[PDB]
Amino acid sequence: GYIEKLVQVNRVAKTVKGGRIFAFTALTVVGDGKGRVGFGRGKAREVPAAIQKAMEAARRNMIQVDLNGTTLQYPTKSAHGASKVYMQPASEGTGIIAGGAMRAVLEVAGVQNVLAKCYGSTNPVNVVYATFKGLKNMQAPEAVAAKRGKSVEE
Template structure:
């Protein structure tokens, strides 16, 4: 009689960061011994909570290139400052021929950006932002590097700024009400008398002759 054992279910551990391959290409290197074929991978990783990084590595196999890029991205992690569910202010950065402009967006608008920039902001956990590539370069590597330069150069003053809207506590509201009531009690009541001008009625008496 065969023994039926219980199947064990192993739970897979969730990865520390979400990752997405942005660019994967073949690279050929010509040497004295001949041509060497390898793969180059551009990988974006992030925790969707403000931290994001990129890695660019080569390998003889696709999996080797991706693993090396993942380890490289973990070393290049940056923190994106998020203020009121968006970026602190507008900024423009340049890397070689690539030029990227990033600016805040109102709540509910989401991420208004193209392919590579959108991926970086989504994995970085930015809820609302607007970005575009101003330069003529369509190279994904240079555009990603320009974007990371922009995200790293936000001003600390804008990050630590206080909200413009004034919030009043319950105690302040009660104090204001008491002041208004006391002012009403102190103010004297002024009675204004209106004088009505009485019209004099003159009766004409007719005399009979």
């Protein structure tokens, strides 16, 4: 898909005999607004080159999510590193109640009512890791219902 969003641009440095060498890191998310989504990281010596590399990396390794009509299936709670993430479905009139990496990830993924919240560190890359770990494990019915028939598991 093609929906580009830029999350964070940071400037890092390494020390050499002579002084400091600077570089730029960029984090981006891509998706089609209907279930495909992925993130990418890039590094370069200029901001546009890093952004381009991040877009190219993010356009690969895109995954498919299972969403129940512009909203999640069930309340979920994921984590990565020291970051914890909580999301839960909301009514249609609700917006996206989230901040930073949450908002970009969920808006690009195609959901509109997510009402999320994060605990622990708010490092954007770890937050994105945690959010995709949570979203990639959305089961949806007819798959958790592989044990037996349908309309009895619910």
